[PDB]
C-alpha cells in the first residue's frame, strides 16, 4: 500500500483540474495561485439537465485541511442554491447529508465531491425545488 502524501496528491489534483475530467460538468482549481499549502480550492458545478438546476453554474469553495485526504474536505456553495444538505444561511454543505462525505474514503478527491453533489441535484427531493433567482451569493 503506497500512500501518496497530501501535498503530492493535491499537486496531482491540480494538474487534473487543469486538464479537465470527463464531460467537464464539474471543474476545480486552486483559489490562490501562490497558496503553497494547496488548501483553498474553487469548485464549479453545472446544474444537471431536466432539473430546476439546469442551465445554472454554481461556484463553491472547497477546503482541504491538514488531514486530507484521510479526512474529507469542507465544502460550501458560494452561489445560492436550494438543495438538501446545503445550509440556507451559510452555504455550508452538511457532511452528514452527502454520502461520500459522511462515508469518506481516502480514495476520494475534490472531483468526487463535486461529481456527487451534481448527482444529488438529480435526486427526487432536490430536482423540483424552486430555486432563487440567479445572481445571489452567501456571505463570507
Amino acid at each position: 500500500g503506497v500512500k501518496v502524501p497530501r501535498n503530492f496528491r493535491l499537486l496531482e489534483e491540480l494538474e487534473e483540474g487543469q486538464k479537465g475530467v470527463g464531460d467537464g460538468t464539474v471543474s476545480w482549481g486552486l483559489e490562490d495561485d501562490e497558496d503553497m499549502t494547496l488548501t483553498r480550492w474553487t469548485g464549479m458545478i453545472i446544474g444537471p439537465p431536466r432539473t430546476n438546476y439546469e442551465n445554472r453554474i454554481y461556484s463553491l469553495k472547497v477546503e482541504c485541511g491538514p488531514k486530507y485526504p484521510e479526512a474529507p474536505p469542507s465544502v460550501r456553495f458560494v452561489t445560492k442554491i436550494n438543495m438538501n444538505g446545503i445550509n440556507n444561511s451559510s452555504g455550508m454543505v452538511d457532511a452528514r447529508s452527502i454520502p461520500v462525505l459522511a462515508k469518506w474514503q481516502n480514495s476520494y478527491s475534490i472531483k468526487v465531491v463535486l461529481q456527487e453533489l451534481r448527482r444529488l441535484m438529480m435526486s427526487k427531493e432536490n430536482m423540483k425545488l424552486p430555486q432563487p433567482p440567479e445572481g445571489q451569493t452567501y456571505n463570507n
Binding site: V2, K3, P5, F8, D33, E34, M36
Partner: protein, 148 residues
C-alpha cells in the same frame, strides 16, 4: 518496502549531507521531510528552506518527487514550490539516489542560472534585471526562510 529504500534512509540519517537535514516521515517511509540551509555567498544565505520528497511506487526506475514548502525566489522554482531540474524529469537514472537529488537542489541554490530552466517569469527577471532579482531573493529569504 524495498530494501533499497531502507538502506538509503539509514545512510541519510547516519551520514547526513552537509547543510541538509532529511528524515523519513513517521507514518510514511516513502515521504521525507527536508531542510536545506541557504548556501553561503548565495542570495539565500541565512535562510532555512523546507522541502518535501516522495518516492513513488516505481522508484528507483522513476525519479523522486520533490517540492519546496518554503516560498523562494529562484529561476528553477515556481509559485507552488515545484522544481525544474533535469534529474527530476528525463535525466533520472536508477544509479542516482535521494542524496543526489538533495545535493543537486543545494547546488541550484548556490548557483542560480536563469538560462537553465524552461523559460518563466522569474528566470526572465534574473536574466534581464539580475540585481533586482537577487534583492528579491534576499528579501524573500528574510521574510519566509528565517524563524520558519
Amino acid at each position: 518496502l524495498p530494501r533499497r529504500i531502507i538502506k538509503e534512509t539509514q545512510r541519510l540519517l547516519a551520514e547526513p549531507v552537509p547543510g541538509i537535514k532529511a528524515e523519513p516521515d513517521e507514518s510514511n517511509a516513502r515521504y521525507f521531510h527536508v531542510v536545506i540551509a541557504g548556501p553561503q555567498d548565495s542570495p539565500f544565505e541565512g535562510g532555512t528552506f523546507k522541502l518535501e520528497l516522495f518516492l513513488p511506487e516505481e522508484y528507483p526506475m522513476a525519479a523522486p518527487k520533490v517540492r519546496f514548502m518554503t516560498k523562494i525566489y529562484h529561476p528553477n522554482v515556481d509559485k507552488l514550490g515545484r522544481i525544474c531540474l533535469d534529474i527530476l524529469k528525463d535525466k533520472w537514472s536508477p544509479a542516482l539516489q535521494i542524496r543526489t537529488v538533495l545535493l543537486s537542489i543545494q547546488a541550484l541554490l548556490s548557483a542560480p542560472n536563469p538560462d537553465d530552466p524552461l523559460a518563466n517569469d522569474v528566470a526572465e527577471q534574473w536574466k534581464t534585471n539580475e540585481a533586482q532579482a537577487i534583492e528579491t531573493a534576499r528579501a524573500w529569504t528574510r521574510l519566509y526562510a528565517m524563524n520558519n
